[PDB]
Amino acid sequence: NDEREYLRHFWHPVCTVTELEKAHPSSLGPLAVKLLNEQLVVAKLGDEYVAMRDRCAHRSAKLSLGTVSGNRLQCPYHGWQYDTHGACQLVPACPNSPIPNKAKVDRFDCEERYGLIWIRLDSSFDCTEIPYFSAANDPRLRIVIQEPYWWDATAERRWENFTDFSHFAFIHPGTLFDPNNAEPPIVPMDRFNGQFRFVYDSFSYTCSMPFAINLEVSKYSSSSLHVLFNVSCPVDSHTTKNFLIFAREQSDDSDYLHIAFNDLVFAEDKPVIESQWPKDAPADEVSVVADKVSIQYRKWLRELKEAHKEGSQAFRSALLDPVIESDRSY
Amino acid sequence: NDEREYLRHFWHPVCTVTELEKAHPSSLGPLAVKLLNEQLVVAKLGDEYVAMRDRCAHRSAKLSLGTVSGNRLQCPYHGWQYDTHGACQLVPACPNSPIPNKAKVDRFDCEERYGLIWIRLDSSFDCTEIPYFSAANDPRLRIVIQEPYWWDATAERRWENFTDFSHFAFIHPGTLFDPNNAEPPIVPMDRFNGQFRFVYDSFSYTCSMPFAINLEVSKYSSSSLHVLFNVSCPVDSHTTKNFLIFAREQSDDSDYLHIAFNDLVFAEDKPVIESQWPKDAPADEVSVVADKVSIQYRKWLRELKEAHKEGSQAFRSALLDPVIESDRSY
Amino acid sequence: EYEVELKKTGQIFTVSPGSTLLQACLDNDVRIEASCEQGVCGTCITPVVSGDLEHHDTYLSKKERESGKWIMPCVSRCKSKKIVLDL
Numbered sequence: 001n002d003e004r005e006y007l008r009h010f011w012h013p014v015c016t017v018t019e020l021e022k023a024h025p026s027s028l029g030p031l032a033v034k035l036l037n038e039q040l041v042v043a044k045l046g047d048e049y050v051a052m053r054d055r056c057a058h059r060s061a062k063l064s065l066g067t068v069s070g071n072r073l074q075c076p077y078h079g080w081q082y083d084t085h086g087a088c089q090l091v092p093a094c095p096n097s098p099i100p101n102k103a104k105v106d107r108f109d110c111e112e113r114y115g116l117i118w119i120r121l122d123s124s125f126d127c128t129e130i131p132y133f134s135a136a137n138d139p140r141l142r143i144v145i146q147e148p149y150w151w152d153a154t155a156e157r158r159w160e161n162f163t164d165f166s167h168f169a170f171i172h173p174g175t176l177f178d179p180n181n182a183e184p185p186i187v188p189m190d191r192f193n194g195q196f197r198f199v200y201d202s203f204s205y206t207c208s209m210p211f212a213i214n215l216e217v218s219k220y221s222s223s224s225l226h227v228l229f230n231v232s233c234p235v236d237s238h239t240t241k242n243f244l245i246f247a248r249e250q251s252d253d254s255d256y257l258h259i260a261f262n263d264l265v266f267a268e269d270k271p272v273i274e275s276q277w278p279k280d281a282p283a284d285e286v287s288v289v290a291d292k293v294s295i296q297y298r299k300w301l302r303e304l305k306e307a308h309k310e311g312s313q314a315f316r317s318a319l320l321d322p323v324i325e326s327d328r329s330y
Numbered sequence: 331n332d333e334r335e336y337l338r339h340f341w342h343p344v345c346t347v348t349e350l351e352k353a354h355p356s357s358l359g360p361l362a363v364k365l366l367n368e369q370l371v372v373a374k375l376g377d378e379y380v381a382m383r384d385r386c387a388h389r390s391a392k393l394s395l396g397t398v399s400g401n402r403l404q405c406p407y408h409g410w411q412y413d414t415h416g417a418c419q420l421v422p423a424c425p426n427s428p429i430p431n432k433a434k435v436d437r438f439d440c441e442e443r444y445g446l447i448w449i450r451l452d453s454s455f456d457c458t459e460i461p462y463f464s465a466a467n468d469p470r471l472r473i474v475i476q477e478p479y480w481w482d483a484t485a486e487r488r489w490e491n492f493t494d495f496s497h498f499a500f501i502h503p504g505t506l507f508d509p510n511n512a513e514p515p516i517v518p519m520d521r522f523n524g525q526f527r528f529v530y531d532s533f534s535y536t537c538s539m540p541f542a543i544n545l546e547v548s549k550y551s552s553s554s555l556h557v558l559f560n561v562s563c564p565v566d567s568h569t570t571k572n573f574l575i576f577a578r579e580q581s582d583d584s585d586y587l588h589i590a591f592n593d594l595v596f597a598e599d600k601p602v603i604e605s606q607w608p609k610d611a612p613a614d615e616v617s618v619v620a621d622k623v624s625i626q627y628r629k630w631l632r633e634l635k636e637a638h639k640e641g642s643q644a645f646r647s648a649l650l651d652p653v654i655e656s657d658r659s660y
Numbered sequence: 661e662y663e664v665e666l667k668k669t670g671q672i673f674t675v676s677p678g679s680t681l682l683q684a685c686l687d688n689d690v691r692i693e694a695s696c697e698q699g700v701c702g703t704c705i706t707p708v709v710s711g712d713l714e715h716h717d718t719y720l721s722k723k724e725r726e727s728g729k730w731i732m733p734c735v736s737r738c739k740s741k742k743i744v745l746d747l
């Protein structure tokens with residue numbers, strides 16, 4: 001249902017690498033996944049992470065109950081095998097007949113990065129990249145990948161909560177609220193290279209549109225820096241599979257000191273954000289000046305929506321044209 | 331859809347008072363309630379039981395997850411606070427900024443009586459009143475408020491089961507059937523003051539429309555009184571939250587003796603009334619002579635539903651115009 | 661310290677010095693949405709044909725502000741003497 005069609009051009013994370021390896025005893029998958037209400041299967045065929053529609057072209061069985069055979073995905077029902085382009089190469093019942101030309105299942109751009117598996121459902125605008133994680137490569141940093149966490153909220157609403165400042169005092173009094181710096185500021189926001197960028201005082205955001213946040217917290221550079229990377233998988237209209245990867249300089253402490261803390265603040269948000277109805281933000285919400293980030297976010301998604309209808313070039317401009325508001329130089 | 335629109339003009343019970351006090355440790359509420367598919371929140375602000383739509387005007391969190399602070403209801407997300415008129419009176423993020431005029435939520439007529447909280451969603455026709463309970467104030471009687479009991483059944487069908495005389499022999503054979511009173515009488519039924527009134531020998535029904543039933547019983551076992559006040563709340567298309575208050579003259583025995591008995595009668599009804607399908611009674615049900623109470627009630631509802639269409643006064647007339655069939659005065 | 665304004669509906673009126681452009685509009689029965697009556701939500705955005713403008717909002721991009729094609733009447737004003745809104 002096509003108010004969300006523009007979302008198909010972006011790269012979305014569907015599972016962790018370790019979720020795929022855990023899925024089937026072979027460690028190759030297949031793993032079933034759902035993205036923007038599409039039912040897909042992921043599997044490692046050879047050296048490629050391949051993503052096809054989880055529906056076989058023959059009698060419509062789910063390839064995710066199949067098995068990986070060599071470099072192919074084998075349907076569990078009558079054993080057809082599919083190659084990295086989703087084409088059937090073996091029909092065991094008539095191995096000497098021709099393979100019908102329609103014996104084919106849709107395939108989607110599937111690439112690994114940062115420890116997660118990303119899928120891009122519609123490549124026809126050739127102008128979106130996998131979101132940016134600042135801490136990959138940086139060898140001073142230890143990187144932990146938390147289990148995915150699922151919310152009954154939309155990627156847009158989850159996004160907005162992660163970049164929200166006004167809510168600390170009420171949802172996170174014990175864990176995030178700084179009573180001396182109690183009231184949030186207004187900050188300039190830049191569009192650059194498909195990302196939103198803004199800073200605090202020091203927290204620095206690089207939000208690859210639509211659903212990814214890259215938050216670099218430094219302790220006025222004195223101590224040492226901490227990076228949060230949080231991206232929402234729009235599973236369906238009501239649901240998100242949410243991924244948090246975090247990196248830290250100070251690696252001497254326990255990973256589960258941080259994992260529990262993150263876990264805690266997410267548990268504080270979840271019941272509120274899930275309560276918001278209607279699940280998608282209607283046009284009768286009343287804002288005030290602290291909501292700059294949420295408004296600017298919605299402004300740009302609307303433009304990306306309209307730009308999409310106009311077509312490829314319009315969308316490329318909408319996404320990548322810079323819109324600088326601050327003094328920082330690019 | 332809006333075939334139930336007329337029902338919004340009546341007072342409906344949403345919860346017992348204890349339910350609201352129990353809902354949150356402050357004993358002030360808030361408590362969430364569903365009335366005719368509407369999501370509402372109920373709270374004690376100062377001296378008032380207040381009812382609002384359970385949806386914040388900022389970013390649409392459920393206020394039922396919030397907390398009562400002072401004489402206002404404070405949202406869980408960013409702590410906007412709403413007064414007894416549903417107007418925001420504090421935006422914690424910009425305390426030195428003026429509150430938007432649209433920063434308000436719908437408020438509803440909300441009044442406590444008999445130990446229950448009543449809400450009127452539409453007050454425009456200004457002509458409905460909270461059902462009549464005969465045993466309030468009468469200091470000779472001991473009143474008990476059972477816990478709400480829920481049925482997968484509509485308020486109309488719950489009402490028809492309660493005033494039905496024909497089911498005693500079959501659903502309640504060992505608890506309410508009188509062997510040599512096995513065939514039900516046809517009875518005069520008057521409309522007075524927006525109530526149905528009729529008796530049976532005694533059993534004296536005073537049913538404030540649409541969903542309340544007040545049954546006084548001058549026992550053939552006592553020469554002393556016993557009173558059943560039952561009111562169905564239509565929470566949605568398929569289910570009711572049902573309330574039972576009963577008073578008794580012979581107040582010397584255990585409350586639970588009668589509570590257990592009522593609970594058993596309802597247990598005998600419940601499966602059968604839930605089995606009735608469609609949930610709303612269609613035109614092809616075939617009534618008989620002994621269904622006089624069923625018929626008059628469907629007739630009055632149908633008239634009231636029509637009157638609602640033709641506007642305020644035609645409704646006030648269909649409710650309040652008297653119609654006498656028996657030989658009593660009023 | 662006073663400004664007039666026109667429309668594609670021809671209606672024309674004056675913003676007394678104590679009023680927001682938005683309040684002037686509503687006083688003269690122009691339907692025009694509002695929420696954050698400070699310059700952030702953006703629902704009151706309305707389009708401009710002519711006139712020289714001062715922005716006080718936090719919704720319009722610097723490039724949008726520098727184009728005289730938009731204005732947020734809840735907080736912004738006209739330093740020119742006339743302004744025409746395409747409404």
Ligand code: FES
Pocket residue numbers: 056057058059060061075076077078079080
């Ligand atoms: S369904 Fe896949 S082989 Fe028959």
Ligand code: FES
Pocket residue numbers: 386387388389390391405406407408409410
């Ligand atoms: S959503 Fe209620 S205060 Fe922000």
Ligand code: FES
Pocket residue numbers: 693694695696697698699700701702703704705717719732733734735
């Ligand atoms: S009304 Fe929201 S910005 Fe003018």
Ligand SMILES: [Fe+3]
Pocket residue numbers: 161162265269
């Ligand atoms: Fe949060």
Ligand SMILES: [Fe+3]
Pocket residue numbers: 491492502595599
């Ligand atoms: Fe019964």
